[PDB]
Amino acid sequence: MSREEVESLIQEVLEVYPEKARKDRNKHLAVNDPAVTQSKKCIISNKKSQPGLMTIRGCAYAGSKGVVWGPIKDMIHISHGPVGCGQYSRAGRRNYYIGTTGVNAFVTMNFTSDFQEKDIVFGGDKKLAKLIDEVETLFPLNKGISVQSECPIGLIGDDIESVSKVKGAELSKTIVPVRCEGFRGVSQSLGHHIANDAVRDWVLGKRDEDTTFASTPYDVAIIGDYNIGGDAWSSRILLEEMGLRCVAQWSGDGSISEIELTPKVKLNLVHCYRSMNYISRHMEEKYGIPWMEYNFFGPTKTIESLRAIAAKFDESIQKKCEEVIAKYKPEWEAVVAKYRPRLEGKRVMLYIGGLRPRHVIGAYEDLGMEVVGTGYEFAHNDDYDRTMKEMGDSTLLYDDVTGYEFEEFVKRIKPDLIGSGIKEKFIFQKMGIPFREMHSWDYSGPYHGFDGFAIFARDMDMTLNNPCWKKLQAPWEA
Amino acid sequence: SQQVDKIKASYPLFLDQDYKDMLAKKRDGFEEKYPQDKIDEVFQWTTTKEYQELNFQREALTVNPAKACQPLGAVLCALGFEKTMPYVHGSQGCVAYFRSYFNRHFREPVSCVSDSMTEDAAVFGGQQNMKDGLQNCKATYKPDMIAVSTTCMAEVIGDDLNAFINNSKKEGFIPDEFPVPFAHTPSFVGSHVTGWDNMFEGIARYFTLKSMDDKVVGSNKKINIVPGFETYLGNFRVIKRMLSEMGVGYSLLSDPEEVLDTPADGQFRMYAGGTTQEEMKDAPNALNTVLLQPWHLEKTKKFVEGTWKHEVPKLNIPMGLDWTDEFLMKVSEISGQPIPASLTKERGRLVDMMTDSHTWLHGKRFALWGDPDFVMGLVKFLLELGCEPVHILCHNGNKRWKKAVDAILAASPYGKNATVYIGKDLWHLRSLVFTDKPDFMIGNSYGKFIQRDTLHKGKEFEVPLIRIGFPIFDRHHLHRSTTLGYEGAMQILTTLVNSILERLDEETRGMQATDYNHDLVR
Amino acid sequence: AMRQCAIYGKGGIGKSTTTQNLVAALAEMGKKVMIVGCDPKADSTRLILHSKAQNTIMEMAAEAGTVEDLELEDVLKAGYGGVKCVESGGPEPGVGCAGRGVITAINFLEEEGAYEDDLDFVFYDVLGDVVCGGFAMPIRENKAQEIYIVCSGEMMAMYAANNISKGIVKYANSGSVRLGGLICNSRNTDREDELIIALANKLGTQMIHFVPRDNVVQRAEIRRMTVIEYDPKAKQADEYRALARKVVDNKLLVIPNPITMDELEELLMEFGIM
Amino acid sequence: AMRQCAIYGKGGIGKSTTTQNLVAALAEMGKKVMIVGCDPKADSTRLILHSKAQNTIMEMAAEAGTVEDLELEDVLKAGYGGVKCVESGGPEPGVGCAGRGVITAINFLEEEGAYEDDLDFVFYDVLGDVVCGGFAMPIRENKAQEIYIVCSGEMMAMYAANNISKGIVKYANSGSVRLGGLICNSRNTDREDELIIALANKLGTQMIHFVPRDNVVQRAEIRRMTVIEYDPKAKQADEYRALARKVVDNKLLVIPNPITMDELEELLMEFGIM
Numbered sequence A: 001m002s003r004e005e006v007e008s009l010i011q012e013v014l015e016v017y018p019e020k021a022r023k024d025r026n027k028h029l030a031v032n033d034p035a036v037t038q039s040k041k042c043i044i045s046n047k048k049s050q051p052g053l054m055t056i057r058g059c060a061y062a063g064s065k066g067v068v069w070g071p072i073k074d075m076i077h078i079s080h081g082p083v084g085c086g087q088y089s090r091a092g093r094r095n096y097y098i099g100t101t102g103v104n105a106f107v108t109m110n111f112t113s114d115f116q117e118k119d120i121v122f123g124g125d126k127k128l129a130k131l132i133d134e135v136e137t138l139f140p141l142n143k144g145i146s147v148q149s150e151c152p153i154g155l156i157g158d159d160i161e162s163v164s165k166v167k168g169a170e171l172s173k174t175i176v177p178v179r180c181e182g183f184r185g186v187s188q189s190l191g192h193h194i195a196n197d198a199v200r201d202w203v204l205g206k207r208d209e210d211t212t213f214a215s216t217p218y219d220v221a222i223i224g225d226y227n228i229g230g231d232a233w234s235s236r237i238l239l240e241e242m243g244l245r246c247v248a249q250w251s252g253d254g255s256i257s258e259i260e261l262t263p264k265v266k267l268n269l270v271h272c273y274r275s276m277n278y279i280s281r282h283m284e285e286k287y288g289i290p291w292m293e294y295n296f297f298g299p300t301k302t303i304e305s306l307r308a309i310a311a312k313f314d315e316s317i318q319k320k321c322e323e324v325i326a327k328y329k330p331e332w333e334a335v336v337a338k339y340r341p342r343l344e345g346k347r348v349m350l351y352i353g354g355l356r357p358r359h360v361i362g363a364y365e366d367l368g369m370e371v372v373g374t375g376y377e378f379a380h381n382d383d384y385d386r387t388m389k390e391m392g393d394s395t396l397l398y399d400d401v402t403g404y405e406f407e408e409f410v411k412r413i414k415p416d417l418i419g420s421g422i423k424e425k426f427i428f429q430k431m432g433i434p435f436r437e438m439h440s441w442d443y444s445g446p447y448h449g450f451d452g453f454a455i456f457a458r459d460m461d462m463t464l465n466n467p468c469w470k471k472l473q474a475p476w477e478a
Numbered sequence B: 001s002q003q004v005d006k007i008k009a010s011y012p013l014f015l016d017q018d019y020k021d022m023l024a025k026k027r028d029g030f031e032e033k034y035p036q037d038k039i040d041e042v043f044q045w046t047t048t049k050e051y052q053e054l055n056f057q058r059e060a061l062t063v064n065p066a067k068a069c070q071p072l073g074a075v076l077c078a079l080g081f082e083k084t085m086p087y088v089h090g091s092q093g094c095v096a097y098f099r100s101y102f103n104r105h106f107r108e109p110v111s112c113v114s115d116s117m118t119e120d121a122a123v124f125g126g127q128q129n130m131k132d133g134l135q136n137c138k139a140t141y142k143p144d145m146i147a148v149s150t151t152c153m154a155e156v157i158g159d160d161l162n163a164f165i166n167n168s169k170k171e172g173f174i175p176d177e178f179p180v181p182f183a184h185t186p187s188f189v190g191s192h193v194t195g196w197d198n199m200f201e202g203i204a205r206y207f208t209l210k211s212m213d214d215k216v217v218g219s220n221k222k223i224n225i226v227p228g229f230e231t232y233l234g235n236f237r238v239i240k241r242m243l244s245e246m247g248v249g250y251s252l253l254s255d256p257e258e259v260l261d262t263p264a265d266g267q268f269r270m271y272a273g274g275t276t277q278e279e280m281k282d283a284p285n286a287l288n289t290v291l292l293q294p295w296h297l298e299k300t301k302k303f304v305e306g307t308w309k310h311e312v313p314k315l316n317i318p319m320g321l322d323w324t325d326e327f328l329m330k331v332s333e334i335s336g337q338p339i340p341a342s343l344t345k346e347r348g349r350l351v352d353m354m355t356d357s358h359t360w361l362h363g364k365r366f367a368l369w370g371d372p373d374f375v376m377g378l379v380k381f382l383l384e385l386g387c388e389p390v391h392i393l394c395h396n397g398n399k400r401w402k403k404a405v406d407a408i409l410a411a412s413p414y415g416k417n418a419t420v421y422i423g424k425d426l427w428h429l430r431s432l433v434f435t436d437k438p439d440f441m442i443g444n445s446y447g448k449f450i451q452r453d454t455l456h457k458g459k460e461f462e463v464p465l466i467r468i469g470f471p472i473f474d475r476h477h478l479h480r481s482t483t484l485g486y487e488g489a490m491q492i493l494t495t496l497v498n499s500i501l502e503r504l505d506e507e508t509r510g511m512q513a514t515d516y517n518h519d520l521v522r
Numbered sequence C, D: 001a002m003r004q005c006a007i008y009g010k011g012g013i014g015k016s017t018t019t020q021n022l023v024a025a026l027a028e029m030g031k032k033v034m035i036v037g038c039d040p041k042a043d044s045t046r047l048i049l050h051s052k053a054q055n056t057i058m059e060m061a062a063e064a065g066t067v068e069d070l071e072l073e074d075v076l077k078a079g080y081g082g083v084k085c086v087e088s089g090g091p092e093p094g095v096g097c098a099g100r101g102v103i104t105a106i107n108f109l110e111e112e113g114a115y116e117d118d119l120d121f122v123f124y125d126v127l128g129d130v131v132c133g134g135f136a137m138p139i140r141e142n143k144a145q146e147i148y149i150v151c152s153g154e155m156m157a158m159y160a161a162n163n164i165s166k167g168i169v170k171y172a173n174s175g176s177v178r179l180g181g182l183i184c185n186s187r188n189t190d191r192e193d194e195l196i197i198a199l200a201n202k203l204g205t206q207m208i209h210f211v212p213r214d215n216v217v218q219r220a221e222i223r224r225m226t227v228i229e230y231d232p233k234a235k236q237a238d239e240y241r242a243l244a245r246k247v248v249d250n251k252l253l254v255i256p257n258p259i260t261m262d263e264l265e266e267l268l269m270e271f272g273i274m
């Protein structure tokens, strides 16, 4: 658990690699040291993955279609390219929404151009135009269209921008071309950036000359919340009870109309800094809308964030925030009193994507658990700077960890619980360690606010204290 | 608010009054949603014949397809070999998606690697990526064989798998003797089953083509079994059990049964039992080769007939009664082993179950979809059972397969109301089940949404889904079921009859309204 | 100001050398001209930089990791007469994808300013074999507005010009790009002037200039520099200055009208013999 | 026999016409030859077929859906001397991806026989800009075993030949394909023969022949026919006959030895002036 032991473990794990792979991978494993916020602490991120090492990262298409654009309900998102890309991405994420699917909401559906050989050889711009015409014919109540590119689209130089412009002018529809080819970037982060750029270029400035919207001194926009299991609703009920008027949600149970109405708000409450800081900064520079980060994981973080948000408004909002915190205090007090004795002192290792490896630490600490290791898939150095103040001393930090690295680290540290994605769940359940899916909340949730903290504590207790983990070893063996 | 004693997850938490009011206020204030009357009108329109004709006039847009890309099937084929690592040459997002798909279907670890080709590799080629990835994979995960597939990005730019692997071996990145079979699997050609075919042909050609001089047909007194793209472990299990019970020497090539059903005993085995390299090398010496799924094993059949000089029998998938009988009879003819009494008793028990459940099964109307061979066998079994497969859909089918299924349907009186669709997706099937309503629909988990749609038109228009096929995501441990042989026929029969009985029990549960038919004995 | 031209034509017809000599003449006229090579062969800016510049966009993006870590000053250089030269990188023949490299280079140049300057002219020297949409990138909406085709009396050259006009048709209908004219670099064909004039009339465009085949151009290219720098008093230098003046004063921008195969066969059966 | 050769070179250097005339010379010699045009423009088999071949593999596959539904007869045509001619399809310039089309066409030819016949020579005429692996497809394992590069005295042709050798190296290392020799097409440069022979020596290869630049080829091509067919008594017909004889009798097949930019520059400075 000491620094020297963790460093020796790092070297032992890296020993198996070839020289080039070892030299690269040494820079992505580190031992946490607070009061040190930079990339000097032998941790670098946002780099190319080493080939043939079973990485967990996705593509820019996943970061654009699957993350930023897909949860938008009244919009048809077309996976332009071969089949498969959109089939694996179909309904795999739990961005919850309200609507009549197939007539006015299209989050679950899968629209694609289904490229063949002739589409590759002769191009697919005419096919894209015909596809847009058919989409308009068969789904009248769609409020917009987005065209998410895949790898061959970017290779063969298809002009989706011209088609989008012409068809939008012809049908008076908003068509957003996203050049989220999978080979672009090194992970989903470039997909986040490209999606934010497309939002800025094609959707954000639509209502610039419109002043019919009624502004209020209490206008806020929720940024970077994708409503995984209902998280955005759980946050929104708190924010609306404490006095604000949440105009927009970016981009979970969210519509194109509230995306266009975001430039009218007074404050931008950013949850996922990694995926949406670009559009937050753009709105700050253009419309002069301040943006502040907030955390709604666990009672401590949500109380602190609520007070910080209320500090930005008049004293009435702060008074209402005090009332809402007082009202919700006994519920989470009961939850901690029920579940903390069962989970006190348990050690957790996490490996999630760009924001959650550091945001969920407060909720785990509120339950008496210690996070003895964390890592990111696609986070940049600002994410690690934020993380280093939240994570314990002499604790493992990993960037774009490999399957072998994660397996060896878990074998040596021997945690009580691991929070990662679907591609490691059964690996670590085989080894006998309780596993919690921290992407989709293991098909449960929400985990935001106090209403989400109750479910979070219940799920952690359910998985950690299940009797199945006591039966891994057959009685006739030792 | 949450009661500590009774904690509510998203359902039914978001049915609370405060959440309902907040959601209504948000929708009314900032969503600019169409009025509910307009939405209802549009939905009712979508469930009509005019909408069906507009939907079937589609030529460029695909909505809710039922198929995947070739590298998924290539990975599944590569997983069936002993200590073999699937290696997709291309971009990493593809491999992440493949692993997530197979993890969600099998609830098992799925090992596959990528060389993580990027913009730089897209422009300059991925030969350096190939060398580095092969060396890293062999050093780290220590496989006995690396099977290389391709991503659409590498297929577009024309990356030469053979040249890249040869340069990797000649520059010392991997041993010259290490087996690295490869296959070109373009995602814009065919589907996942085509990728399985391509990968198996590549492995067979890697291990057999050069060493054809010393091979004699029938030397090892075995029958090669090529199972194709299979996602039911019970299918491999039943094929092996039937062949072993019959006393037949067999060589099941690309067996992934062990690696997809690893025991949980506190130890993680990345590799489990599969087809050995010795089996693959000795395969030409077998008496013959039987293809379990002949409608997506065309390239493999061509290679086996042209190189190994095996006369591959013209057998259908051993699904149902008649086709299992033909499969067993052909195996007996090829190997000379008589069919044992155990298989005769199993066939008799299947016939007995058919006889017992015929009254409930007869006349039922089914929509269904899946892969070509699976769909063909399911239609054959349904015709044997006396059911009516009204809507037969196969996205990855062709004209020859459609002709074969049409000939099968025309041979039975129960195929009069059946139409076969190729190149149609699940939006087409949603229109069909709205217009020509069947009793049930048999398919993967993606049909659940279709069922939901029907329930929105009314409880009397709902078409229940029976989950048989791939992928099955919303149910647990259904991949252990059997589909092939008499055992699979019994399992499918039980599932169908009990689904019918469950629906009938649900429809007659209303006391004083319809409970006069809530019969204890059925 | 801020004119934008692309140079297309049959492979090996002399697009690169003619473009470089035109650019040198324009710079001699005191104009500020930029040149972008859209060829995987990084040979479009040699005669201005007096060297095969190794600072191509794609290989330096490789050295810097991603394209997002690339800076304009790193790959942009100045040459003879203050001409700015940028080269799009490319793979070795028979590997990779050059169209993607051209797409990436053009997108990088657009994102990081580059053309957001006071430059009068921006030239896009494109390769002979336009085989994908990547090599038509200079012909997109906010890119080169006028296209010049370099051709010669050979019928494969005119078939290439016809095919390139067929390609230009789609990007002209969807944009504001137009065919300025046809440049003729003579290959000592028998009836070259009449043949190229007839082809231009059939396509609806005009003969902008005629460039005689002079070995002074090859001699200059051996010395890594243009005819203007090699021999300011040569007749070929005068012809290049006349061509530069013509393109400066050109005003006929017409959507191409491609002809069929049989029409071309008749064109050179009547205008190519005797 | 069944010798498979691939014709590469700089764009517009004359690979297509030289290949067609060579194939016709072989046809007069009693050899069974088949040409395959790996170019988006179907201009590589016009001379043998006396017309543009409209039955290209990729276009007919697009018309009939998938290339699997195609058949060899619908695309394989015979011409002068019984020379079978096959052409790969391709999109109009500036759209699609021609390399993928070439890959698909070659795979279709390989599956449906074509090569497996009594042909003595199988030629693959490739375009001048090999921008991707699709146009290196004829250089794969069981494809063209000899590569002939068409060069000229102009420096750009020399640099293109060096670049093409650089690209060839990665396929020659991993396979049995070898650079048979350089073919020189005259373009009236000063020291043509000296430059070509020096570049061949530096590359480690040989000059197969020196084809003179004569106007008869323009007249023969205008008539949509080969020079040997147009004027068997002409001097250029004798030169093409000698080129055919030397190609048939070539036994030198080596892995190319590419030279860097500085070596080519110094070679050209020494051998290209005066």
Ligand SMILES: Nc1ncnc2c1ncn2[C@@H]1O[C@H](COP(=O)(O)OP(=O)(O)O)[C@@H](O)[C@H]1O
Pocket: C009, C010, C011, C012, C013, C014, C015, C016, C017, C018, C043, C128, C185, C186, C211, C212, C213, C214, C215, C216, C217, C218, C221, D011, D154, D155, D156, D157
């Ligand atoms: N007007 C001309 N006079 C003499 N030689 C020329 C002329 N134009 C081109 N050339 C020769 O032809 C070759 C053309 O090469 P290049 O400009 O790269 O062709 P492209 O760029 O059109 O493929 C050059 O090497 C040059 O020596």
Ligand SMILES: Nc1ncnc2c1ncn2[C@@H]1O[C@H](COP(=O)(O)OP(=O)(O)O)[C@@H](O)[C@H]1O
Pocket: C011, C154, C155, C156, C157, D009, D010, D011, D012, D013, D014, D015, D016, D017, D018, D128, D150, D185, D186, D211, D212, D213, D214, D215, D217, D218, D221
């Ligand atoms: N030896 C030669 N002498 C004179 N002209 C030639 C010669 N070889 C080819 N040509 C001319 O080149 C034109 C065809 O060029 P093409 O074959 O398309 O070039 P490449 O195949 O080298 O790219 C013909 O019109 C012909 O007149």
Ligand code: ICS
Pocket: A063, A067, A093, A188, A226, A228, A272, A274, A275, A352, A353, A354, A355, A356, A357, A438, A439, A440
């Ligand atoms: S968007 Fe990002 S990988 Fe910020 S791509 Fe990923 S629904 Fe993760 S850690 Mo899946 S940067 Fe969201 C994420 Fe975090 S899909 Fe979800 S859980 S908070």
Ligand code: CLF
Pocket: A059, A060, A061, A062, A082, A083, A084, A085, A086, A149, A150, A151, A180, A181, A182, A183, B069, B070, B071, B091, B092, B093, B094, B095, B097, B150, B151, B152, B153, B187
């Ligand atoms: S990195 Fe990302 S998911 Fe991969 S392809 Fe590229 S955009 Fe898509 Fe697509 S059809 Fe299948 S899954 Fe690929 S091999 Fe192509």
Ligand code: SF4
Pocket: A155, A156, A157, B156, B157, B158, C096, C097, C098, C099, C100, C131, C132, C133, C134, D096, D097, D098, D099, D100, D131, D132, D133, D134
């Ligand atoms: S034809 Fe163009 S888009 Fe296709 S692989 Fe070659 S360079 Fe890339």
Ligand code: ALF
Pocket: C010, C011, C012, C013, C015, C016, C039, C041, C043, C126, C127, C128, C129, D010, D011, D156
């Ligand atoms: F041969 Al080039 F641009 F150098 F067409």
Ligand code: ALF
Pocket: C010, C011, C128, C129, C156, D010, D011, D012, D013, D014, D015, D016, D039, D041, D043, D126, D127, D128, D129
């Ligand atoms: F033979 Al070409 F451009 F037609 F080099």
Ligand SMILES: [Fe+3]
Pocket: A426, B106, B107, B108
């Ligand atoms: Fe399991």
Ligand SMILES: [Mg+2]
Pocket: C015, C016, C017, C039, C043, C044, C127
């Ligand atoms: Mg050039």
Ligand SMILES: [Mg+2]
Pocket: D015, D016, D017, D039, D043, D044, D125, D127
């Ligand atoms: Mg040619």
